[PDB]
Amino acid sequence: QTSAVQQKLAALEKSSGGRLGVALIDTADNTQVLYRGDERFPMCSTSKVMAAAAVLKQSETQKQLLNQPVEIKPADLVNYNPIAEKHVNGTMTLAELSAAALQYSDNTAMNKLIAQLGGPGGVTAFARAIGDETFRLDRTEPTLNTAIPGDPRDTTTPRAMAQTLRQLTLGHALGETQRAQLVTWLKGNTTGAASIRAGLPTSWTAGDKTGSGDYGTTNDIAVIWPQGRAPLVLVTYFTQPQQNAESRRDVLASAARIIAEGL
Numbered sequence: 001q002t003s004a005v006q007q008k009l010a011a012l013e014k015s016s017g018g019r020l021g022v023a024l025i026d027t028a029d030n031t032q033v034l035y036r037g038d039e040r041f042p043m044c045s046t047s048k049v050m051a052a053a054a055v056l057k058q059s060e061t062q063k064q065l066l067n068q069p070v071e072i073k074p075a076d077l078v079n080y081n082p083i084a085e086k087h088v089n090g091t092m093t094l095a096e097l098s099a100a101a102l103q104y105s106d107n108t109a110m111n112k113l114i115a116q117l118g119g120p121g122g123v124t125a126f127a128r129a130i131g132d133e134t135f136r137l138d139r140t141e142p143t144l145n146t147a148i149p150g151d152p153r154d155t156t157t158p159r160a161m162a163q164t165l166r167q168l169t170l171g172h173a174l175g176e177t178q179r180a181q182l183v184t185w186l187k188g189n190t191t192g193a194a195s196i197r198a199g200l201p202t203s204w205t206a207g208d209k210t211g212s213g214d215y216g217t218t219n220d221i222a223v224i225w226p227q228g229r230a231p232l233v234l235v236t237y238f239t240q241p242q243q244n245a246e247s248r249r250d251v252l253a254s255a256a257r258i259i260a261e262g263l
């Protein structure tokens, strides 16, 4: 079937000129709403959630891991490094790198998480360990953002990412103090006010991770606490046909507003 909500998302998509993917899980009743839910999209910086979560999982068996220093050298800086550049020729802890990656979208910080995990495939391995058969991380920053149409590298589907985000933030994929830390980090994101959360009633609270890349790729994944009811998980991915396209955070806000109005 095609619901009214799905038809509205298709109208939004048509007007946008791009390709929109949406997955909602309403934890009040476990129901899902999806739009292109099984199509692949480039994750861009939304993949930082999986990497940070994989390090949190490692920390369950190493109480001091998050306080472990990692050297930041000039050669490690990539294209967007607002926290790591302050620490070149010094160190950041794995907690500091996780916070920087998640809350500031620091790409050097992501590369240090990836390295801690043994490379992109270590991120994918953690995904598989928590039941996500779809996610794949193939490259480091910045090349994981090339976002070329039809390229499977560094992609997932909206359905898979919503399910994973639920398990990580609300379920039991992580230990309870690690889950709480992930949620704290997401709720302190600095980059999200124009994306999903722009489409939601302002009384609601949320944590999110944005992403952006080539092909005007504009993404957000969020855990949401609406006023008065059980939490939601919402994924909104968007990508466009030309390599140089502009970001469209407003499309993500519009998708979220359609979802919220449909509850």
Ligand SMILES: [K+]
Residues within 6 Å of the ligand: 045, 080, 104, 105, 106, 107
């Ligand atoms: K970024």
